[PDB]
Design a binder for these strands. Sequence first.
RNA 1: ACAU
DNA 2: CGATGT
Length: 136
Amino acid sequence: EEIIWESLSVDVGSQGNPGIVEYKGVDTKTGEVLFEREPIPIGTNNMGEFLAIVHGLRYLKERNSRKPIYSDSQTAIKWVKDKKAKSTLVRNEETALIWKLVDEAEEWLNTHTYETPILKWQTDKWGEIKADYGRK
RNA sequence: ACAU
DNA sequence: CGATGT
Ligand SMILES: [K+]
Ligand SMILES: [K+]
Ligand SMILES: [K+]
Ligand SMILES: [Mg+2]
Ligand SMILES: [Mg+2]
């Protein structure tokens, strides 16, 4: 502890897993929604959590912001660190769109630099991350 | 077991 | 109850 309030918080929302995936980023202090991705018809929770972090990195870099990013996803934080999303989701026609976005997110990571700290939101201590969809 |  | 991941 404690919370770094000067930060961006991201989270995925889904209908089914695998299922319809969306994500959003919010100002941790105020909850102001800063970006929201259009729903993707089929994806996994972890793909969406991964895309949300990468989008946050791109959003902050474009704005010359040094704020950290909070995510509640152990998996996606590691995938971003590794620059490699190790998803089990079948690559087929139904999943082509999500897999294109994930491939493109990995590609951006491998062609850009950033100093943004990517931090674990401590749900057990602090409650739900501020970007949560409130579906559970 | 942990995190979603 | 189920699924995605380390
Ligand atoms: K939720
Ligand atoms: K959670
Ligand atoms: K499990
Ligand atoms: Mg989450
Ligand atoms: Mg959530």
